[PDB]
Design a protein around this nucleic acid. Sequence first.
RNA 1: GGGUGCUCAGUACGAGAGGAACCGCACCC
RNA 2: GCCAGGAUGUAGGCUUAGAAGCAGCCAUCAUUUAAAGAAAGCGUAAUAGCUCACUGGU
Lengths: 122, 135, 67, 164
Amino acid sequence: MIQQESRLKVADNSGAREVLVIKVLGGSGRRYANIGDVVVATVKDATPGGVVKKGQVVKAVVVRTKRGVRRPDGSYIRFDENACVIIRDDKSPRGTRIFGPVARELRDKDFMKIISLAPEVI
Amino acid sequence: QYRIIDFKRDKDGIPGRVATIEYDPNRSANIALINYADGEKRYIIAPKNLKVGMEIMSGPDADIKIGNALPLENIPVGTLVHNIELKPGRGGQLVRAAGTSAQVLGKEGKYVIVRLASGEVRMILGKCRATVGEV
Amino acid sequence: KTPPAAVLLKKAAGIESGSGEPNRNKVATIKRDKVREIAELKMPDLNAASIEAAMRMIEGTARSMGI
Amino acid sequence: PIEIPAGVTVTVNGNTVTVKGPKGELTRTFHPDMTITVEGNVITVTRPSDEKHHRALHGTTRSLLANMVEGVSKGYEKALELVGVGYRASKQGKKLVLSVGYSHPVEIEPEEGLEIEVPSQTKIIVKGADKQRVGELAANIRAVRPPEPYKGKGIRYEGELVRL
RNA sequence: GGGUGCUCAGUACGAGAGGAACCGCACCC
RNA sequence: GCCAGGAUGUAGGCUUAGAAGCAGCCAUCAUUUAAAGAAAGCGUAAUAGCUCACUGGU
């Protein structure tokens, strides 16, 4: 499960390439993150000369997880990676392009811009 | 196997030959086997530069050669010596086999003045014997 | 009302202002001629009995302003 | 004593007093220590002693009776007014329907012996024979949405001083 | 009583920047 | 205590943007009164409103 020190791929064009989880937001006791949860993380890798830099602390919403989610209709959806979107504070992506497929669960957490920019939603 | 060393050198007149020269760890020094012309064998501390084959003699007529032992009165001023006798016929009690050979500095009457390696100076009775050479 | 005793007295007296009254009287004017006249005109507004009373009041306002 | 006007019938039974009249009928119980009697044409109240608490009880009992007599003789009323754009009252049957800024209207039905009249959409009148019950229902109506401090919107008594 | 998501509403209000509140829904303790 | 009067010239004069009983400066008369200040406070931008003094009642 995604927890402190878990590495997450960044599914946006903000400049960040990978982040390392510091904590899961939502109240004392929260330890694991799944789709829709917001984490505080440190940028582990980033493209040089960009707006986001290595070592910086950012907030990011989880949009794809290997653990997945069970749905009310009996379906279960999971992905082949744990990914997140940074975010400006209003949830909009800092970059202008999203690479690779993203999970539809992001729609429930109001990450509408990312869903619209995604090449495909599964 | 600690060997018996001759510190008396009283086989006067009888020629001996340095048979061998070996180390003696119990003496931290070298010793030589001496075969005498009369059949007797004896070990002595081997002075510096003594080699297998050289002859050895002791007594008043001995040749002044390293390894030879004579009464101090029969020894040339300036010669280095060791295994110095303090009492005629009591064997050497000074510089027996460790240290630095003393040196004859002068002869006066019945005395022979000798300067030990320590700068120390002593007037021993010429009757006392000493071996020529460096230990 | 009619012109206050003050303005009547001002116009009568012949001035545009009052005073520091006890000390610097601002002007003189004739009573039995003028104070009476004013007393007459001001009468509808005076609770006076006789004109002589009507006067005492008018003359009394003239003092407050020094005339 | 309290004068019993014409048309008014007063009945006393222990500490319970019933007064009937053209405008209504009211029954009220009073403090045990007070003695109430209909002396022919007037109601008299007799306290047991002259201490203070009794003297105070005596005047309080007397007033209540006076007002009970006023209520059934001189049918009582209390007016309220609505202040606020869109705030209005209407009469739908015996029910008072209030539109006072909530998602839906508030409907109030008076109990027996009470009437509510709405002469204009921003005026409500509560009336009945019992002065107390009239006072109580009007306080309950106002309490649905009392006047707010910034603009004075809500329900207020007719002469309510509520400076914004 | 409380936790949480939401709604009320980008409404009311405010010159603007901004921006509620009272009403109400759902899972949970 | 409670009820009712507390008035007329008149917003006195002057001054002041205003200045009306009540910023300040002069005064502080007179009327009709049972009584009622050219007003003792609050109030007003100035007004208004409210009290008070005095009088009646109870």
